[PDB]
């Protein structure tokens, strides 16, 4: 049934799905926020190569 | 060689899952156009991991 | 050493083994084969560099 | 097999590229002699009563 | 396949993608990193091999998952922009 990310169902799996879309929303945010910053984590990456 | 199998299988399943959660399709059609959606991916994948 | 004494490596010193001889050449042409197939899948030359 | 080879340019490129890589190795690994090996086998026993 | 199928300039394409892939990546990884804990765990009777295979795999896996999960969305946009 379209859209259901298993939220309002039983006990732990529901809170897991909720906390999940929570976490990947916060993620898409975080990486949208590392998106505005092209050239910083480039310094980090090259350091990593070293 | 247990990790690159489950990756293929899970890709195949999870993309249809997502497609159905998001589009409200019947399973076989969901996959009939979600398989027609990740094909060349796993393909080149197989032609590059090798 | 005195005139008439020669030397030779047999056994484990004949062969010489693995990483440091030409094994990164294997990793290398493996990588060249990979970027090739990625220029096949993306039909770019940059995009595989991602 | 033309109009798709015609549409995706580098695909064929990569194919040729490959064919050359191969034939180029198979030159290095190939031993240069005069012609082919032509004669029947001749085995030969050889003793001396001095 | 969001750009040459829809028409999305990379800035929104990339993020929609990394969200559409954010679950599978995580599963394959959380399944594998556990899967190779058998290796890194066994003591006695075949360890050496099991371990030396396992740990390289596990470590190598936890880093290239938590890092490329941030870098790859950028790997694209850095390579995509400069050259087109």
Count other C-beta atoms under 10 Å from residue E62's C-beta: 13
Please give the structure tokens belonging to residue E33.
Answer: 């990193």
Query: What is the spatial distance between Cα D4 and Cα C40, in angstroms, rounded to a whole number?
Result: 13
Compute the distance between CA of residue B32 and CA of residue D39 in angstroms, rounded to an integer.
64
Longest dimension (CA), chain A: 50
Q: Sign of torsion, CA E43 E44 E45 E50?
A: positive
Q: How far is the C-alpha of E70 from the C-alpha of A21, rounded, in Å? A: 17
Taking residue C18's Cβ as centre, other Cβ atoms within 10 Å add up to 8
* Residue reference for tokens 């109009």: D3
Residue A42's nearest CA partner among E79, C27, E47 is: E79
Residue in E23, E24, E32 nearest the CB of B3: E32
Q: Which one-letter DSSP state was computed for residue D32?
A: P
How far apart (Å, rounded) are the C-alpha atoms in residues B28 and B19?
A: 11
Distances from the Cα of B45 to the Cα of B2, D40, D48, E26, angstroms: 16, 51, 70, 18
Q: What is the DSSP letter of E74?
A: H
For every residue of B1-50, DSSP letters joined together read --HHHHHHHHHHHHHHHHHHHHH---HHHHHHHHSTTTHHHHHHHHHHH-
Subunit contact C38:B40, Cβ cutoff 8 A: no
Asked if A35 and E11 count as a contact pair (C-beta separation under 8 A), the reply is: yes
Sign of the torsion formed by the C-alpha atoms of A13, A14, A17 and A19: negative
C36/D8 CB distance under 8 A: no
The CA-based angle A21-A24-A29, given to 5 degrees, is 125
- CA neighbours closer than 13 Å in the CB half-sphere of residue D12: 9
List CB contacts of B15: < 8 A, sequence separation 6 or more: B34, B37, B38, E24
3-class secondary structure for chain C? CCCCCCCCCCHHHHHCCCCCCCHHHHHHHHHHHHHHHHHHHCCCCCHHHC
What are D32's two structure tokens? 């240069």
Q: Are E41 and A2 in contact (CB under 8 A)?
A: no
Q: Which of B22, B26, B27, B29 to mutate to test the interface with A (most CBs of A within 10 A)?
A: B22
Terminal CA-to-CA distance of chain B, rounded, Å? Answer: 12
User: How many residues in total does chain B contain?
Assistant: 50
Q: Please report residues of A whose CB lies closer than 8 A to that of B24.
A: 1-3
Whether residue E28 contacts residue E36, with contact meaning beta carbons closer than 8 Å, is answered with: no
Of E18, E14, E63, E25, nearest in space to A36 by CA: E14
Method: X-ray
CB distance B4 to B49 below 8 Å: yes
Resolution (A): 3.4
**Whether D5 contacts D12, CB under 8 Å:** yes
The DSSP call for residue E3 is: T
Identify the sign of the CA torsion B25, B29, B31, B33: negative
Give contacts of B44 with chain E, Cβ < 8 Å. none
Which chain A residues are closer than 8 Å to B22 by Cβ? 2-3
Rounded Cα distance, B29 and B32, in Å: 4
User: Which are the contacts of E9, defined by CB distance < 8 A and separation ≥ 6?
Assistant: E3
Distance CA C37, CA D14 (A): 8
Per-residue burial over E15-25, b if 16 or more Cβ lie within 10 Å, else e, is bebbbebbbbb
């Amino acid at each position: 049934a379209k859209g259901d990310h298993g939220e309002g169902k039983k006990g732990f799996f529901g809170w897991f799905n909720r906390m999940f879309e929570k976490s990947t929303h916060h993620y898409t945010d975080s990486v949208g926020g590392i998106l505005r910053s092209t050239g910083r984590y480039l310094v980090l990456y090259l350091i990593i190569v070293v | 060689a247990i990790g690159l199998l489950v990756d293929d299988a899970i890709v195949v399943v999870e993309n249809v899952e997502r497609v159905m959660a998001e589009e409200g399709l019947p399973p076989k059609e969901a996959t009939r156009k979600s398989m027609g959606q990740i094909q060349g991916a796993l393909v080149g994948i197989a032609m590059v991991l090798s | 050493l005195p005139t008439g004494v020669g030397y030779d490596w047999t056994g484990m010193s004949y062969q010489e083994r693995l990483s440091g001889n030409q094994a990164p050449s294997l990793y290398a042409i493996s990588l060249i084969v990979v970027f090739l197939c990625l220029a096949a899948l993306y039909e770019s030359w940059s995009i595989p560099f991602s | 097999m033309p109009n798709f080879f015609i549409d995706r340019p580098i695909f064929a490129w990569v194919i040729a590229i490959i064919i050359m890589l191969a034939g180029g190795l198979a030159i290095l690994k190939l031993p240069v002699a005069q012609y082919p090996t032509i004669a029947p086998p001749a085995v030969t026993i050889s003793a001396s009563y001095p | 396949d969001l750009m040459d199928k829809e028409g999305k300039g990379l800035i929104e394409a990339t993020l929609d993608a990394v969200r559409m892939r954010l679950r599978p990546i995580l599963m394959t990884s959380l399944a594998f990193i556990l899967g190779v804990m058998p290796l890194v765990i066994s003591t006695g009777a075949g360890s050496g091999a099991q371990n030396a295979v396992g740990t390289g795999v596990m470590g190598g896996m936890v880093t290239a998952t938590v890092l490329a999960i941030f870098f790859v969305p950028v790997f694209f946009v850095v390579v995509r922009r400069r050259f087109s």
